[model samples]
Target: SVDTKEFLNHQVANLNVFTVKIHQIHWYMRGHNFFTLHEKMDDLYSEFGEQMDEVAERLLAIGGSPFSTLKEFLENASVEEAPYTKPKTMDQLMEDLVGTLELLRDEYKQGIELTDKEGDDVTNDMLIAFKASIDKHIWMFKAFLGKAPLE
Candidate 1:
């Protein structure tokens, strides 16, 4: 019970942090890919918002307290924030995206096994589907970088 709650809560926090990080990328980005990547950043942030809200709702459904503040998010999330030090190149931003995606994917990978051990089919399915989506983004973003998807 405790582990399940922690896993879900961690996802909620990570999503919140990543959403804002994408928002920063949307604003502070300047490069040849700005036109397309600008739109991409917007879409990514929007989807993360939806996903974060859904996960939070599920936490509430299972009687777990979802983190509701930036302080808590920064304290709990495993993903590092991209602070506004300077404008980032498209390559730099996408590299950050890949790193965060990989981090999230691995954490979800662990959660998938944990839920299965607890007979939590629903959580396991959620993590698997989300991880699949993550794998897709890693492919697309890495393709933008002209690299193999898994490297």
Candidate 2:
């Protein structure tokens, strides 16, 4: 249980870092329907913030390091920091989201498999919950760009 919890904390920290970075991009993003895009990005960030906190608290509940420190986050993060230069078009933003979402899904899916392999049902269950959300989000995000039929 402790191992599973710690592992999940690392996973959560990883996701939260990326989520924050995405929010930063959201703030600086331009082109296309600025108002609608801005609002959607805001919602995305807010939702991710809530999700991050929930995972962090769950980590603490299990006596794991939440890894909330910025230093640790930067050191452990696999997701690259996005450039400050604003994307030139709406399609660019979608493309970036697509890349990021795909990476996120891969990590979450791997984590799910890891938990299952370790026979840690509690962690496996947590992974399942997040995986479902991640899959749905990935599908919806890709659909927004008319790339849903990717096979």
Candidate 3:
């Protein structure tokens, strides 16, 4: 049987990693679109922060201790950190964001399936909503890269 609590905790870790990666891009991004891209990155990281909090709280509500330290998040997260020293172009940053969102979308889909199987409607619903949001992000980023929606 899939443990919904553990699944939620994993999501918490992934969100933490995602937020930090977005922050890294926000800090390191340089280009003619610096102001616009920086602001967008800020919005993305903030949204990720809010989602991370909600997932952590949900884990707690279900009697699970969410990962609270950087080490714990690093150990549990499926998302990998971006290279802090690398200078990324605007398009490269968008590509990275697209890839991260695709990862998150897959995770959320798995979570939704597991939660549904476990009869955890709340968690399932949350995963569904997150998946939808991730899909929108992927679409926007793809469009920004001048790619087709199906790409």
Off by over 4 Å in 3: none
Return the candidate ranking by TM-score, descending.
1, 3, 2
Q: Write the per-residue lDDT of candidate 2 for residues 1-151, one digit (tens) a residue.
A: 4356666676676767777776766777777677887787777777667767877776777677677688877777666675666445776776776677677678767777877887867667876787677678778767777776253
The backbone clash count of each candidate, in order, is 0, 0, 0
| Highest lDDT model number | 1
As for lDDT, the candidate ahead, 2 or 3, is 3
Against the reference, the lDDT scores of all candidates come to 0.87, 0.71, 0.86
Task: Show the lowest summed lDDT stretch of 10 residues, model 2.
Answer: 79-88
lDDT of 3 by residue, 42-139 (tens): 89988889999999999888888999999999999988775667566889878888888988898888888888888988888988987888888888
**Per-model RMSD to reference:** 1.3, 2.6, 1.2
Report residue 5 deviation for candidate 1 (angstroms).
Answer: 0.5
Candidate 2, pairs of clashing residues: none
Q: At residue 97, give the lDDT of candidate 2.
A: 68
